[PDB]
Amino acid sequence: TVNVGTMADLKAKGELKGNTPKGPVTVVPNGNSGQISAVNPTCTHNGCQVNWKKANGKFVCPCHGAEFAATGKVLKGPAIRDLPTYATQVSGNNILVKA
Amino acid sequence: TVNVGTMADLKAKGELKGNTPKGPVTVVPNGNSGQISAVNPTCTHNGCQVNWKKANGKFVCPCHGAEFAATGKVLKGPAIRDLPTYATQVSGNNILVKA
Numbered sequence A, B: 001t002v003n004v005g006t007m008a009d010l011k012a013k014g015e016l017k018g019n020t021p022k023g024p025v026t027v028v029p030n031g032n033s034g035q036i037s038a039v040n041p042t043c044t045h046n047g048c049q050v051n052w053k054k055a056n057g058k059f060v061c062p063c064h065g066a067e068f069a070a071t072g073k074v075l076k077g078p079a080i081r082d083l084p085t086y087a088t089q090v091s092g093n094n095i096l097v098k099a
Ligand code: FES
Pocket: A043, A044, A045, A046, A047, A048, A061, A062, A063, A064, A065, A066, A077, A078, A079
């Protein structure tokens, strides 16, 4: 597992990025009760790294505009596959990304 | 140098496609005074062939949605360069594309 920071950090920063054995990870809130979502930000269209835009509640790809929900669900093309995701575990405020 | 059809054909069909020594060409109307425009429909982003949508007066790329005006001018990204164009000559109602 990869410790990407605390729930307090996620709150203050809006997101937490990390590097895992299976690729990059960006952790964002996925609700208001502590739910979080860890996605591999590699756009499923042409591999650009997507950018979490909290004001719109979506990841937006800077290369061709694909958009994804906090869960990684594709919301707008040209990507047609959801972002890969990672299971997470919060252990005493620490956000742990698995795999 | 490449005869793609007549103005009547262009009016009835909306566009005329052809092949030239410098690549494909799509000829579309560019006004109501008989003005026409010949572009190389190869999208300047990643090379997909853009498609003329007469109702919207634009070439729309089916791959990532870039749009171009009848003149080839880029109107919407991700493309950032205009479509190459070809000089044209209307000779006796015949549309000649010079490549
Ligand atoms: S790489 Fe993300 S939309 Fe193309």
